[PDB]
Amino acid sequence: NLAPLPPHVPEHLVFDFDMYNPSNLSAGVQEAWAVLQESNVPDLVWTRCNGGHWIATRGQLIREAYEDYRHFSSECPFIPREAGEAYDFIPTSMDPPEQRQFRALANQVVGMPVVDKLENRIQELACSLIESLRPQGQCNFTEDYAEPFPIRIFMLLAGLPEEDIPHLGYLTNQMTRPDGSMTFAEAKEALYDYLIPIIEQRRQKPGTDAISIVANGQVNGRPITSDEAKRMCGLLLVGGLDTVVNFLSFSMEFLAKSPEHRQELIERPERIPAACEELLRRFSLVADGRILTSDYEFHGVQLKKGDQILLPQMLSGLDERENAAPMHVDFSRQKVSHTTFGHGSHLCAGQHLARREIIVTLKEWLTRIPDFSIAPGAQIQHKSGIVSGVQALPLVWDPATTKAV
């Protein structure tokens, strides 16, 4: 379904890419997006899909636009337009300097000191989950680890019952990879309706959990409102329940096909943080964007006020101008260039938690289950959206080649 080409967009810039169903998806989702970086595609193109919008395809442009909030506003950060307009999460839907005081509060609840505090629980849970799976000789990695590991850690940090995971995960997925069953607004509304009474309770009787801390924080000299707290907590849920989950699956899928990469990390685990960065580059998975605040000429292209521009975080590190042989996983790259956690003022608040979860997973999985593979004749399907994902990842292994610690 192609929207009529706006008069200001010249035809040579048209490239009808569908971010929710890219044509080359069967080759892998990153590969499907990388079609935007072939020699036939300009640096900045207009797709008529999904209501019509720009797509920047090169790291330089993506970084520049994410820095220039004056022209590229986060007030409407999702495609399609109806989703972007309904989007009111905090701090993401705010530009500097307004986002600042809310972002400071986000850092308080998901930032570094919180990770270096929950680290024992993170380590504990990874070991527990992996040891439980180890003697089976198989698992569906998405449901058996990729979901419960980061999600249970998030529910712990937020003080929310694990029994609510299925419902919350469903709603989160509707916002990033919609199925058509409900509008963005309806999904966001269901999430908000869940949070509303919980926020009320925790303003009545504060705990030390993330929701309590947000709901009782302060902005420009005054208490945060219940509305503001809801809008921030909603974003924390979306951010805690989707990205790391899917990232872990892309990474484990790769490791399942790459015995030599597994051994690099097992033999020299001090390389694990660098490997984490390289996997974050190669299997980058987010693509949101911004809205034009005014008419603006950007790299020779006339953008109009109100035009949406997708600035795919995924693409920067896949750009061969940023990394040579970008589709090759090389743990020894002298610089792993990427914007996987975003760029500019909205650079991911949870990136430290994410990295810790990834690094713990790499170490603890490979220690106990050093040799595994994708199940014979299994077809792995990826899905694409604001956050791209892995549908299922059936893994197999010989339990005789595993180790308890």
Ligand X SMILES: CC1(C)[C@@H]2CC[C@@]1(C)C(=O)C2
Residue ranges that bind ligand HEM, judged by CB under 6 A: 74, 77, 91-92, 99, 103, 106, 110, 235-236, 239-240, 243-244, 247, 285-286, 288, 313, 340-342, 346, 348-350, 353-354
Helices (H), 134-178: 141, 148-158, 165-176
Judged by beta carbon, residue 80 or residue 150, the one nearer ligand [C-]#N is 150
Q: How far is the CB of 270 from ligand HEM (least distance, A)?
A: 21
Nearer to ligand X, 323 or 340 (CB): 340
Burial letters 338-370, b for 16+ CB under 10 A, else e? bbbbbbbbbebbbbbbbbbbbbbbbbbbbbbbb
**CB of 172 vs ligand [C-]#N, minimal distance in Å:** 10
Structure-token pair, residue 328: 């090759």
Closest distance of CB 257 from ligand HEM, Å: 20
Chosen residue from 95, 209, 253, 288 binding ligand X by CB under 6 A = 288
Q: Which of 28, 239, 289, 394 binds ligand [C-]#N (CB under 6 A)?
A: 239
Q: Note whether 243 binds ligand X by CB under 6 A.
A: yes
- Please tell me the chain's helix, strand, coil percentages from 3-state DSSP, rounded to the nearest 5: 50, 10, 40
Q: Is the distance from CB of 395 to CB of 372 less than 8 angstroms?
A: yes
Helix axis angle, 148-158 relative to 165-176, nearest 10°? 110
Decide if residue 386 touches ligand X (CB under 6 A).
yes
- Is 348 a known ligand-binding residue? yes
Compute CA distances 166 → 129, 162, 235, whole Å. Answer: 18, 9, 17
How far apart, in Å, are the Cα atoms of 135 and each of 130, 253, 365?
9, 20, 13
Judged by CB under 6 A, which stretch of 105-113, 235-243, 262-270, 329-337 contacts ligand X? 235-243
365 binds, among ligand HEM, ligand X, K ion, none (CB under 5 to 8 A by kind): none
In sequence order, what are the residues at sequence separation of 6 or more whose Cβ sits closer than 8 angstroms to the Cβ of residue 373? 256, 257, 395, 396, 397
Q: Does 66 bind ligand X (CB under 6 A)?
A: no
Complex with K ion: residue 76 or 109, whichever CB lies closer: 76
The residues that bridge with 139 in the sheet, in sequence order, are: 395
Which residues between 70 and 109 bind K ion (CB under 5 A)? 76, 85, 87
Known binding-site residue numbers for heme:
348
